[PDB]
Design an enzyme around this catalytic site. Structure first.
Site, PDB file in Angstrom:
ATOM      1  NE  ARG A  83      -2.085  -1.389   3.605  1.00 58.12           N
ATOM      2  CZ  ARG A  83      -1.395  -0.684   4.500  1.00 58.12           C
ATOM      3  NH1 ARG A  83      -1.414   0.650   4.500  1.00 58.12           N
ATOM      4  NH2 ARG A  83      -0.648  -1.327   5.398  1.00 58.12           N
ATOM      5  CE  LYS A 121      -5.920  -4.447   5.731  1.00 59.40           C
ATOM      6  NZ  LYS A 121      -6.186  -5.656   4.889  1.00 59.40           N
ATOM      7  CG  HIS A 154      -5.374  -4.793  11.300  1.00 63.73           C
ATOM      8  ND1 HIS A 154      -4.040  -4.450  11.425  1.00 63.73           N
ATOM      9  CD2 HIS A 154      -5.457  -5.575  10.194  1.00 63.73           C
ATOM     10  CE1 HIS A 154      -3.359  -4.973  10.412  1.00 63.73           C
ATOM     11  NE2 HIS A 154      -4.190  -5.688   9.670  1.00 63.73           N
ATOM     12  CB  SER A 186       2.186  -5.757   8.247  1.00 66.20           C
ATOM     13  OG  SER A 186       0.983  -5.266   7.684  1.00 66.20           O
ATOM     14  CG  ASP A 189      -5.873  -8.291   7.778  1.00 70.50           C
ATOM     15  OD1 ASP A 189      -4.822  -8.500   8.364  1.00 70.50           O
ATOM     16  OD2 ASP A 189      -6.088  -7.187   7.286  1.00 70.50           O
ATOM     17  NE  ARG A 223       1.297  -9.517   2.423  1.00 71.48           N
ATOM     18  CZ  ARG A 223       0.763  -9.286   3.622  1.00 71.48           C
ATOM     19  NH1 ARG A 223      -0.300  -9.953   4.034  1.00 71.48           N
ATOM     20  NH2 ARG A 223       1.339  -8.407   4.418  1.00 71.48           N
TER      21      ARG A 223
HETATM   22  N1  LIG Z   1       7.085 -17.141  15.759  1.00 71.43           N
HETATM   23  C1  LIG Z   1       6.382 -16.710  14.670  1.00 71.43           C
HETATM   24  N2  LIG Z   1       5.048 -16.480  14.715  1.00 71.43           N
HETATM   25  C2  LIG Z   1       4.370 -16.041  13.642  1.00 71.43           C
HETATM   26  N3  LIG Z   1       4.916 -15.830  12.437  1.00 71.43           N
HETATM   27  C3  LIG Z   1       6.240 -16.037  12.245  1.00 71.43           C
HETATM   28  C4  LIG Z   1       7.057 -16.503  13.372  1.00 71.43           C
HETATM   29  N4  LIG Z   1       8.322 -16.615  12.922  1.00 71.43           N
HETATM   30  C5  LIG Z   1       8.327 -16.258  11.621  1.00 71.43           C
HETATM   31  N5  LIG Z   1       7.082 -15.937  11.215  1.00 71.43           N
HETATM   32  C6  LIG Z   1       6.775 -15.452   9.864  1.00 71.43           C
HETATM   33  O1  LIG Z   1       6.348 -14.099  10.102  1.00 71.43           O
HETATM   34  C7  LIG Z   1       5.327 -13.796   9.167  1.00 71.43           C
HETATM   35  C8  LIG Z   1       4.004 -13.596   9.908  1.00 71.43           C
HETATM   36  O2  LIG Z   1       3.206 -12.988   8.896  1.00 71.43           O
HETATM   37  P1  LIG Z   1       1.617 -13.030   8.858  1.00 71.43           P
HETATM   38  O3  LIG Z   1       1.227 -13.198   7.400  1.00 71.43           O
HETATM   39  O4  LIG Z   1       0.972 -13.939   9.854  1.00 71.43           O
HETATM   40  O5  LIG Z   1       1.371 -11.487   9.259  1.00 71.43           O
HETATM   41  P2  LIG Z   1      -0.050 -10.801   9.545  1.00 71.43           P
HETATM   42  O6  LIG Z   1      -0.052 -10.523  11.018  1.00 71.43           O
HETATM   43  O7  LIG Z   1      -1.188 -11.620   9.000  1.00 71.43           O
HETATM   44  O8  LIG Z   1       0.130  -9.390   8.773  1.00 71.43           O
HETATM   45  P3  LIG Z   1      -0.831  -8.656   7.672  1.00 71.43           P
HETATM   46  O9  LIG Z   1      -1.797  -7.822   8.517  1.00 71.43           O
HETATM   47  O10 LIG Z   1       0.166  -7.801   6.911  1.00 71.43           O
HETATM   48  O11 LIG Z   1      -1.504  -9.768   6.884  1.00 71.43           O
HETATM   49  C9  LIG Z   1       5.208 -14.989   8.230  1.00 71.43           C
HETATM   50  O12 LIG Z   1       6.157 -14.808   7.170  1.00 71.43           O
HETATM   51  C10 LIG Z   1       5.656 -16.143   9.121  1.00 71.43           C
HETATM   52  O13 LIG Z   1       6.135 -17.294   8.391  1.00 71.43           O
HETATM   53 MG   LIG Z   2      -2.324 -11.505   7.361  1.00 72.60          MG
HETATM   54 MN   LIG Z   3      -3.535  -6.830   7.871  1.00 74.34          MN
END
Ligand SMILES: Nc1ncnc2c1ncn2[C@@H]1O[C@H](COP(=O)(O)OP(=O)(O)OP(=O)(O)O)[C@@H](O)[C@H]1O
Ligand SMILES: [Mg+2]
Ligand SMILES: [Mn+2]
Ligand SMILES: [Xe]
Length: 527
Positions: A59, A205, A224, A242, A261, A325
Site C-alpha cells: 500500500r 483496505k 484489524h 503486519s 484480517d 503474497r
Molecule cells: N514465531 C512466529 N510467529 C508467527 N509468524 C512467524 C514466526 N516466525 C516467523 N514468522 C513469519 O512471520 C510472518 C508472519 O506474517 P503473517 O502473514 O501472519 O502477518 P499478519 O499478522 O497476518 O500481517 P498482515 O496484517 O500484513 O496480513 C510470516 O512470514 C511467518 O512465516
Molecule cells: Mg495476514
Molecule cells: Mn492486515
C-alpha cells in the site's frame, strides 16, 4: 450491467462489459499469451497464477486522501488536526481525480465485480468494483464476500470502487498532493478512486477504512485482527501489525477459521468482513505452514513471487519485495466456519507483536488497564531495531480517533469476560525470532485456559505478568532476560524501549481516562 449504468458513474463508451467474471474466465484472462506488461500472469506448477503488481508492492499510505466536506469534517480523524494518513482533499480536486479515472476506464473492456464487505446483512456494505485488469478483479473476487445468485439479482451498490491504476495525475504538484498516484475516498458520493498504483490491497483496505468509520459510530467494534473458534465454541481474536502472525497463527488445524484480517464485534459476536485470506509467502515452509501452502492452487493469486522457467516457485526470493503474497478464497482452508464467517463473543484477545528490540516476553497476561494501554500504543518493531507505534494495531485504516475503537472494544470485552494476552512473536536475546512451533504452543496454552490462573512472575519496568511455566515451551525463554549473557544487557534495551512507549503515549494523556492509563504503561524515572 448496462453501459448506461456505467455512464452514471462517469464512464463512457464501454464496448465490452464482463460482469461477475467466473474464476474460469479470470484464469484464462490472466494467461492470455498476448497480454503485455503488468497485466500478464504466469502459471506455476502448483496450479495457481502468479502476477507482478508493478512498481508498488505494498500500500501507499502517503497517497491516501479523504474528501473533507460536511459529511466528514467533524467525524473523521484528520491528519492535519496524532499521526495518521487521513489527509484532507477538496471536493474540487476530487472531481479532477474522478475525471482521470473515468476517462482512463472509458473505451476499455471493463470487469465489474459486485461483492460484500461484512458477513452480516444488517451492517455489510454492498460494493461494486470496476477495473480494466483481470487480476485486479480476481483479487477482489477472492478477498470480498462473493454474493449468491439471489443476492446479485437485487444488488444495489452502497459504495463504488473505480480502479484506474494505469492513469496518473499530471496536476499533483499544483494540487499539493504527495505524488502522481492517488488513493482517494469521498463519503458524500460513496466512492473510492485509485490511480497510479496497481496494488490490489488498496481496495481491501479502502473498504476496511470505510467499515472502520461506520461500525464504531453504531456501537460495533471494527478490528484489524484474525479470528477463530474451537470445537467448544470459544472464540479468539489476534490483533497485530503486519508480519506479526495474525494469518500464520490463526490458520491452526485445531481451530475453525473465522477470518484472518478484518472483523467486527456486534451484539451477537465476531464476524469477518472478507471472503478470502491474504497470506505472506516469503520463505514459506510447507512443513511449518501446511494449510497456507496447500491453499496455493488454482484460483489463488500469487503476487510478486519468483517463478522459475520450469514453473516452480522460489518462495525464498525477496529481491523484488519481501512482501510477496498470495490471496485465496477462504474455502481453500479446510477447517473454516461456514456458511457464514462469524461466531460468538471472543473470550481470548491476543495482541501479537514482533519485538525487534528483544525485550518483551513471549507471553504475558495483561491487566484490564494494560490491555487499553497496549491497544492504543500498538507496538511492533523491525530489524538496529526500528519501532512502529500504530494505534489499535492498525492506525493506517482508522477513520475515527483511536479512543473510539478502544471504547467499543472494551465494552465488548467486558460484556464477554474476555482476557487479553501480549505475545512477542519476534525476537529475544538470541537475535533470532521465536520459532513458529514454540509460538503455536504458546497460543495453545492461552486458548485452553492453561494461563488464565497460572502462577506468574513480573517483568520489571513493563510490569508484565509472565507464566512461570508453559507446556511444550522451554521454560528458559519465558523470561526475556534469560537469553542474554546478563540481565544487564536486557535492562539497557528495556529502558530504551520503555522510553519509546512513554513518549508515544503522551498524546493520549489530555483526557482523564488516558492520563490514568499511564500507570499501566512502562515505568521509567531515570536517565
Ligand atoms: N514465531 C512466529 N510467529 C508467527 N509468524 C512467524 C514466526 N516466525 C516467523 N514468522 C513469519 O512471520 C510472518 C508472519 O506474517 P503473517 O502473514 O501472519 O502477518 P499478519 O499478522 O497476518 O500481517 P498482515 O496484517 O500484513 O496480513 C510470516 O512470514 C511467518 O512465516
Ligand atoms: Mg495476514
Ligand atoms: Mn492486515
Ligand atoms: Xe482495549
Amino acid at each position: 450491467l448496462t453501459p448506461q449504468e456505467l455512464e452514471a458513474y462517469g464512464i463512457s463508451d464501454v464496448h465490452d462489459i464482463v460482469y461477475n467474471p467466473s474464476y474460469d474466465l479470470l484464469y484464462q484472462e490472466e494467461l492470455d499469451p498476448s497480454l503485455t506488461g503488468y497485466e500478464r500472469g504466469v502459471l506455476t506448477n502448483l496450479g495457481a497464477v502468479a502476477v507482478d503488481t508493478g512498481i508498488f508492492t505494498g500500500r501507499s499510505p502517503k497517497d491516501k486522501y479523504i474528501v473533507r466536506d460536511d459529511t466528514t469534517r467533524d467525524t473523521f480523524w484528520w491528519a492535519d488536526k496524532g499521526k495518521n494518513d487521513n489527509k484532507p482533499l477538496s471536493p474540487e480536486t476530487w472531481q479532477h481525480l474522478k475525471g482521470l479515472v473515468t476517462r482512463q476506464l472509458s473505451g476499455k473492456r471493463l470487469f465489474v465485480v459486485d461483492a460484500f464487505c461484512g458477513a452480516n446483512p444488517d451492517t455489510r456494505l454492498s460494493v461494486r468494483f470496476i477495473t480494466e485488469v483481470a487480476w485486479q478483479a480476481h483479487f477482489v473476487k477472492n478477498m470480498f464476500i462473493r454474493p449468491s445468485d439471489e443476492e446479485l439479482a437485487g444488488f444495489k451498490p452502497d459504495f463504488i470502487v473505480m480502479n484506474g491504476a494505469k492513469c496518473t495525475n499530471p496536476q499533483w504538484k499544483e494540487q499539493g498532493l504527495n505524488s502522481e498516484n492517488f488513493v482517494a475516498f469521498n463519503l458524500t458520493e460513496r466512492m473510492q478512486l485509485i490511480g497510479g498504483t496497481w496494488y490490489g490491497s488498496e481496495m481491501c483496505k479502502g473498504m476496511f477504512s470505510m467499515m472502520n468509520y461506520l461500525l464504531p459510530l453504531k456501537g460495533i467494534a471494527s478490528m484489524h485482527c484474525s479470528a477463530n473458534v474451537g470445537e467448544k465454541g470459544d472464540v479468539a481474536v489476534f490483533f497485530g501489525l503486519s508480519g506479526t502472525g495474525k494469518t500464520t497463527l490463526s490458520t491452526d488445524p485445531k481451530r475453525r477459521l473465522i477470518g484472518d484480517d478484518e472483523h467486527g464485534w456486534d451484539d451477537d459476536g465476531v464476524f469477518n468482513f472478507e471472503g478470502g485470506c491474504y497470506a505472506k509467502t516469503i520463505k514459506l515452509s510447507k512443513e511449518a505452514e501446511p494449510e497456507i501452502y496447500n491453499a496455493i492452487r488454482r484460483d489463488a493469486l500469487l503476487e510478486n513471487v519468483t517463478v522459475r522457467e520450469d514453473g516452480t516457485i522460489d518462495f525464498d526470493d525477496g529481491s523484488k519485495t519481501e512482501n510477496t503474497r498470495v490471496s485465496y478464497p477462504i474455502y481453500h482452508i479446510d477447517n473454516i466456519v461456514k456458511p457464514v464467517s462469524k461466531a460468538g463473543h471472543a473470550t481470548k484477545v491476543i495482541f501479537l507483536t514482533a519485538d525487534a528490540f528483544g525485550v518483551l516476553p513471549p507471553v504475558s497476561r495483561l491487566t484490564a488497564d494494560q490491555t487499553q494501554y497496549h491497544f492504543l500504543s500498538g507496538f511492533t518493531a523491525k530489524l538496529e531495531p526500528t519501532p512502529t507505534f500504530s494505534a489499535c494495531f492498525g492506525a493506517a485504516f482508522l477513520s475515527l480517533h483511536p479512543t473510539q475503537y478502544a471504547e467499543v472494544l472494551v465494552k465488548r470485552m467486558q460484556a464477554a469476560g474476555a482476557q487479553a494476552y501480549l505475545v512477542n512473536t519476534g525476537w529475544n536475546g538470541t537475535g533470532k525470532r521465536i520459532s513458529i512451533k514454540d509460538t503455536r504452543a504458546i497460543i495453545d496454552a492461552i486458548l485452553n485456559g492453561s494461563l488464565d490462573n497460572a502462577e506468574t512472575f513480573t517483568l520489571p519496568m513493563f510490569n508484565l505478568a509472565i507464566p512461570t511455566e508453559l507446556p511444550g515451551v522451554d521454560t528458559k525463554i519465558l523470561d526475556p532476560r534469560n537469553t542474554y549473557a546478563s540481565p544487564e544487557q536486557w535492562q539497557e534495551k528495556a529502558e530504551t524501549l520503555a522510553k519509546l512507549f512513554i513518549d508515544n503515549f503522551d498524546k493520549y494523556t489530555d483526557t482523564p481516562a488516558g492520563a490514568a492509563l499511564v500507570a499501566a504503561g512502562p515505568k521509567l524515572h531515570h536517565h
